[PDB]
């Protein structure tokens, strides 16, 4: 569990084989799409499958939400996936 109140909130990451790292923000899973040298852009994984177009953008140890998710998150599927990172 995770309870603290700080102006700077720290930042949650995954990597997964052939296809790049994953970014862990509000129980979601989201891929870098593009890098602004400074800024890092992201989309929800489940763009493709969810057809989720929720994109986010993380700088330094913080996240930036651009639009909603059209799905539920999956505490069970996101836990699954982080297994195989921890091993
Ligand atoms: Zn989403």
Redesign the pocket.
């Known amino acids: 569990g995770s309870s603290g109140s700080s102006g700077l909130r720290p930042l949650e990451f995954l990597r997964t084989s052939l296809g790049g790292r994953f970014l862990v923000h509000e129980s ?1 899973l989201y891929r870098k799409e593009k890098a602004a040298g400074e800024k890092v852009y992201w989309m ?1 994984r ?1 763009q493709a499958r ?1 057809g ?1 177009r ?1 994109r986010a953008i993380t700088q330094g140890h913080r996240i930036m939400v651009m639009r909603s ?3 539920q998150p999956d505490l069970a599927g996101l836990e699954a996936l982080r297994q195989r990172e921890r091993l």
């Open positions: 979601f929800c489940d969810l989720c929720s998710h059209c799905h």
